[PDB]
Write a protein that binds this ligand. Structure first.
Ligand SMILES: *[C@@H]1O[C@H](CO)[C@@H](O[C@@H]2O[C@H](CO)[C@@H](O)[C@H](O)[C@H]2NC(C)=O)[C@H](O)[C@H]1NC(C)=O
Ligand SMILES: *[C@@H]1O[C@H](CO)[C@@H](O[C@@H]2O[C@H](CO)[C@@H](O)[C@H](O)[C@H]2NC(C)=O)[C@H](O)[C@H]1NC(C)=O
Ligand SMILES: *[C@@H]1O[C@H](CO)[C@@H](O[C@@H]2O[C@H](CO)[C@@H](O)[C@H](O)[C@H]2NC(C)=O)[C@H](O)[C@H]1NC(C)=O
Ligand SMILES: *[C@@H]1O[C@H](CO)[C@@H](O[C@@H]2O[C@H](CO)[C@@H](O)[C@H](O)[C@H]2NC(C)=O)[C@H](O)[C@H]1NC(C)=O
Ligand SMILES: *[C@@H]1O[C@H](CO)[C@@H](O)[C@H](O)[C@H]1NC(C)=O
Ligand SMILES: *[C@@H]1O[C@H](CO)[C@@H](O)[C@H](O)[C@H]1NC(C)=O
Ligand SMILES: [Ca+2]
Ligand SMILES: [Ca+2]
Ligand SMILES: [Ca+2]
Ligand SMILES: [Ca+2]
Ligand SMILES: [Cu+2]
Ligand SMILES: [Cu+2]
Lengths: 712, 712
């Protein structure tokens, strides 16, 4: 509440303040993001710029002054001879006085082409594509029944892929032309266009290449002449619902006419929410939605003792192959698209339980004013349907000495990212026994292309005209564990057999397990590449010992199917060198807070952060502020079941943090939810309890869904 | 209901019938299992002996005669010159006429020593240990305050480990001496005794070796003389609750005085249960608790079409190291202990939801009569707290074209096994979109030994006098997939990069994913050892194609941390050669229905099934009845949090079966649970539905727990 305020995202008022401040500086010549020109200076992003960890810890632990509060302000400088992007620490909040230019990068010339694509830019792009396809109007109507001009009922739409070209400083986008219908992602026409939209005058932008149904055509006029002259082999496209729709069809042979079970919370939340500060049994932690990178949890304690200064989403990637130029061009990095800013409204009873506590926020990303995002996050406790622990202590003669068990519950902090086609559900999950989990579930629409037969060596035919392209999902977390404090060491444990004389039968031998430990002293020792077999136990230790002599530690357990995807060193792989390492441990530093950025998507050849560089000074990691970095992911080969959407079952990855000799015993023993039943020969067994059995009823508030996200 | 009866376990009546039948054969000279002698012929196990798959399929698919119903009857022949164990197909049911001797094994002499340990045998063992420790009475009272004689308030108890000796035909058990208190598993005295209980006359059994607090003593009298003469360095042992108890202690700094959310099912079960036959949306399947091996599902269909003839638990293993003779002796294989027969009563609201449908059964395992097991299984639908699918189709200008989502639900078929210290929760889980999952969660008490400092190279100090021994949990499943029918092939898919000229920029290159496939023609090709990297996509295919040209298939996705544990070929590893293979594919055969047995625990050197042998004829697996075999597991290094119990969070393994081009589109589209919200400028959005929004209340039946398991 009062403490966690340091970790809190910017209020509507705070965002408006920083905006007025920057607008008051007339020399910036700022214009709203909506202006219909690239030739413009604009404030593209504003978010809370976290203070130094040193000062934050002195405020939290040493009772010191509250650290100064600061905005990050990403300004696009389109309106000048040499356009660029610059970032700025605007502070203090409240009462802004300065804007301090952030992280200079000498040598680099391509900041302008590395920019994310804005709303305005898309608008202008829609203008280009309308002009340049003028010659193909007839072609469109004959092949698709749709068009870019007038169009009314049947409009052709497009999906830009990224990155945009073949080298740094390029902004040449492959656009996949589709029919704008329900779930338009699944309706490619077969046309693809390369548009150079590099210039700040949209008048110089041009369609530099055409691809149709397996063939390149140079220009639209050329495809038009060649079609008109019978030289283009074309494909003419087509109650019941669209295959691309979520509307039901088919019948289960055992049909279902009622709602399934739901959660009731008659006694209210058992966690205490206050601002961005949560308490839940042993747990205490803060959170934030960083507009740029996504969801975080900060200052995580269990039982008064710190475990993690920060756990946060760093980058989310989708790397594709293809038969078509667009399909082979696609390496999507979502932080270039505002992964934290596409946190669209959760639907009660669907996305989160009806009983969940829904939380709003504001994002200033490619916006004229701060934008209200309703139910951007939810927080809720749910039954797991599996008991946290249980034991049937039998007496092996017909009866029992006792049954004990603690019904399973968990607190879930959830948000989403829906950039375009895909919907990622982000989870941070807190068990009563000190285990924390991180999960990502993928759902929504797959990224897909027009079917030709050559495209089956890069994916799967999902429908008559639809190829689901092969791709890898990879996600990077930053896991700043501060186990029982700032200073830690990292160690790993393996089982190693020993071959020894049988001590009670000297003729024979005993080959058996033995607990082997490995210390790690330098960063590079703890950079585990995908070929390097990952040790079964990954422990981040405190020097303090538990009551039984063992180092107090937290274990990191990764759930993933990731492998190496791009060849190390090759081109666009420079943007995702974190993807070489399922685990990497660095020594903490203010210069290495993020493994990605908003610029990586459009200049992955020469990005402003290469995670590999973090390891270059190969620093000593004995008793230092350590940071774990985790890559989780999976190879997604589309299948017919992904139509209309990828389903979440089994489509999740993440990791667990588990206490390991951190607590003297099971820290969930504090829970009064436990139930022990004791045997009696005569009458009812003694159902021993510490909370009364409850069977109360309550009723959730009625369903509602706004679906809009505007300023306030 | 009428069909699934072929897969159904034996009724109380059926078990009684087979028993009377075998009792009527006077030449067997049978005695009840309770008789206080090993020198006895007894019926140790009776269970339903599944008919041949050929006949079962002709009954299910070809509309043929119902296959004859048969009991398996494991008889111990203790009362003869050469004791042995023999098994028998007793049938037909109803109206038994014969008992046909099962699976002869020429050459083998050690069937008697391979027997599971019975109640009676434990009784006799308690007699031996009381006699033989007579000299140590004083020692016990001085060190432990407890004893084996009179004892009343303070009785010493024991925990036998397995296997029992150093070669086949031995029955020499290391016993860990403990104080019989609440959670006695965690109270080792420091004494260990090797008892040869090989003879059928308990009068010949003898304590052949003693181990105390780091030293072997030959005999009890010798430890007694040496203690009495000041030569034995000993350790004297010790409101608040026992550390080994489930009773709460400690306080959360944010305390919790109310129950957390619970499931209500006001509209009843949405699945139809009839006998051992279940329907749930697309799903149809049967089940059984095989007393010997555990839970199975049989005849699994989705949408009328078969996917799996059988999915079943085959074996569950716990392989330990130790400082002490017992700790280094312990390789527990639970099927030797009646893994399916220790299915003790589920506690409503704890083990399964209050809203679950609880099912009883009967087991005849080491019993004088069939024994009623209340709530041995449960079946229930629960919300996952994650939507099966969802999408926010934005219009990227402040609003939305629609939100769609299907709230997440799942059907869980659950049982447990609690052999002794450990409690395994077995799950079979059915999602509405055709995904099925198999899960095992471990909880209950760890297997532990007396603390000496040498024991820290085989585990962890959990308490003053308690070492939690290092071990590996490994589980074997039999996964008889019959994907769209009996005949299948197995293939795997990988991503393989290609390096090609950039087709739209010939100066540059494109290094990108490409979908590679691998066919498998022989068994040995599909035996993946732990060093052999497992392909990301493991597909069992039908020849039939979907509407888009792709082979209809089900994908197997393993969730595990298993590695090779014992060296292939070395001794007791002969019992667990399935543990070499995270996946193995065999061609179906009536001689290879199980990868383990009830004999493996006590003769793992020369067991009656070696899974490796299944692969020896290396048969062709192109379009044949294939059987998948899966090993899942994890290295368990005990930690202080495992006290008093191992907690289930993150302590689970298993696998998913997912449709892969099996269905023309998402098979969950049949579900009327889906909700689509449509945008409107004026008033409320159109919340489009196919089941009415529901907010009904109901109340679960009040908590109860019997805790006994007797005949009826
Ligand atoms: C990025 O563009 C900004 C805006 O023009 C440049 O910053 C200005 O630089 C000139 C010096 O040539 C100063 O007179 C202004 O005071 C600066 N203003 C601000 C707000 O920064 C900046 O130099 C450009 N970056 C690069 C690398 O050239
Ligand atoms: C464990 O160690 C022993 C001793 O090195 C090995 O036993 C020897 O094995 C060879 C055959 O490989 C025999 O010729 C020797 O006679 C054996 N000696 C003894 C004393 O047993 C054994 O192979 C090793 N086992 C493992 C799994 O490493
Ligand atoms: C296991 O013990 C059984 C019981 O004695 C043996 O089965 C009997 O064998 C004799 C032949 O020596 C027959 O006369 C009996 O009719 C058999 N009875 C039954 C019920 O099987 C069996 O031979 C023993 N197994 C082995 C391998 O020796
Ligand atoms: C992809 O293939 C090309 C051609 O084999 C490789 O490019 C050559 O790389 C070497 C250096 O390793 C240069 O000397 C040649 O001039 C390059 N030729 C061309 C046409 O580019 C490239 O290294 C390969 N990349 C990968 C990741 O395998
Ligand atoms: C959504 O919220 C906006 C902003 O408060 C409000 O004006 C509008 O009426 C709401 N729309 C719906 C459909 O509830
Ligand atoms: C448990 O069930 C048995 C068998 O029906 C019954 O006799 C007994 O009264 C029940 N015990 C309890 C405590 O409910
Ligand atoms: Ca740290
Ligand atoms: Ca470094
Ligand atoms: Ca099969
Ligand atoms: Ca074979
Ligand atoms: Cu995907
Ligand atoms: Cu374990």
């Amino acid at each position: 509440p009062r403490k966690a305020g340091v970790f809190s995202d910017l209020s509507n008022q705070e965002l408006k303040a920083v905006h007025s401040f920057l607008w008051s500086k007339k020399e910036l010549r700022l214009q709203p993001s909506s202006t219909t020109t690239m030739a413009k200076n604009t404030v593209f992003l504003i978010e809370m710029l976290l203070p130094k960890k040193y000062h934050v810890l002195r405020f939290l632990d040493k009772g010191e002054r509250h650290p100064v509060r600061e905005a990050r302000a990403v300004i696009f400088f389109g309106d000048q001879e040499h356009p660029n992007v610059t970032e700025f620490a605007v502070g203090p909040l409240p009462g802004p006085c300065y804007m301090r230019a952030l992280s200079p990068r000498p040598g680099y010339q391509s900041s302008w082409a590395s920019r994310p694509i804005s709303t305005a830019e898309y608008a202008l792009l829609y203008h280009t594509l309308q002009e340049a396809t003028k010659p193909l109007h007839q072609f469109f109507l004959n092949t698709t029944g749709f068009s870019f001009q007038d169009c009314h009922d049947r409009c052709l739409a497009f999906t830009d892929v990224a990155p945009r070209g073949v080298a740094s400083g390029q902004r040449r986008s492959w656009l996949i032309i589709q029919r704008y219908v329900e779930g338009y992602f699944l309706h490619p026409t077969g046309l693809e266009l390369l548009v150079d939209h590099g210039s700040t005058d949209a008048g110089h932008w041009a369609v530099e290449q055409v691809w149709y149904n397996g063939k390149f055509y140079g220009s639209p006029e050329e495809l038009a002449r060649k079609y008109a002259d019978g030289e283009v082999d074309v494909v003419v496209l087509e109650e019941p619902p669209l295959f691309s729709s979520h509307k039901p069809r088919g019948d289960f042979p055992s049909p279902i006419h009622v709602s399934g079970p739901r959660l009731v919370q008659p006694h209210g939340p058992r966690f205490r929410l206050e601002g961005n500060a949560v308490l839940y049994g042993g747990w205490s932690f803060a959170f934030r939605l960083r507009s740029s990178s996504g969801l975080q949890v900060l200052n995580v304690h269990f039982g008064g003792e710190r475990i993690a200064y920060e756990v946060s989403v760093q980058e989310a990637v989708a790397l594709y192959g293809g038969h078509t130029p667009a399909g082979m061009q696609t390496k999507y990095l979502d932080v270039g698209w505002g992964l934290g800013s596409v946190t669209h409204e959760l639907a009660p009873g669907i996305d989160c339980p009806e009983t969940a506590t829904f939380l709003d926020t504001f994002h200033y990303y490619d916006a004229d004013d701060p934008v209200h995002y309703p139910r951007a996050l939810c927080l809720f406790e749910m039954p797991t349907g599996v008991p946290l622990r249980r034991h049937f202590n039998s007496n092996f003669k017909g009866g029992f000495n006792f049954y004990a068990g603690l019904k399973g519950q968990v607190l879930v902090l959830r948000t989403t990212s829906t950039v375009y086609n895909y919907d990622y559900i982000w989870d941070f999950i807190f068990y009563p026994n000190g285990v924390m989990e991180a999960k990502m579930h993928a759902t929504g629409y797959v990224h897909a292309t027009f079917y030709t037969p050559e495209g089956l060596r890069h994916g799967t035919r999902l429908h008559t005209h639809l190829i689901g392209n092969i791709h890898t999902h990879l996600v990077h977390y930053r896991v700043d564990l501060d186990v029982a404090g700032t200073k830690n060491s990292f160690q790993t444990l393996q089982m190693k057999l020993e071959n020894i004389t049988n001590p009670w039968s000297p003729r024979h031998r005993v080959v058996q397990p033995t607990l082997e430990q490995t210390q790690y002293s330098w960063e590079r020792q703890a950079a585990f590449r995908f070929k390097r077999k990952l040790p079964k136990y990954l422990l981040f230790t405190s020097p303090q010992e538990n009551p039984w002599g063992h180092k107090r530690s937290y274990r990191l357990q990764i759930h993933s199917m990731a492998d190496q995807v791009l060849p190390p060193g090759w081109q666009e792989e420079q943007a995702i060198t974190w993807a070489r390492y399922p685990l990497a441990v660095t020594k903490y530093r203010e210069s290495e807070l993020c493994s990605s950025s908003i610029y990586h998507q459009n200049d992955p050849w020469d990005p402003p952060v290469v995670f590999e560089q973090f390891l270059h000074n190969n620093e000593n990691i004995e008793n230092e502020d350590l940071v774990a970095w985790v890559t989780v992911g999976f190879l997604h080969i589309p299948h017919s079941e992904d139509i209309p959407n990828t389903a979440t079952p089994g489509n999740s990855v993440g990791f667990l943090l588990r206490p390991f000799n951190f607590f003297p015993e099971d820290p969930s023993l504090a829970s009064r939810d436990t139930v022990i039943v004791w045997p009696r020969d005569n009458g009812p067994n003694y159902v021993q309890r510490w909370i009364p059995e409850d069977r109360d009823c309550s009723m959730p508030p009625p369903f509602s869904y706004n679906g809009t996200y505007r300023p306030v």
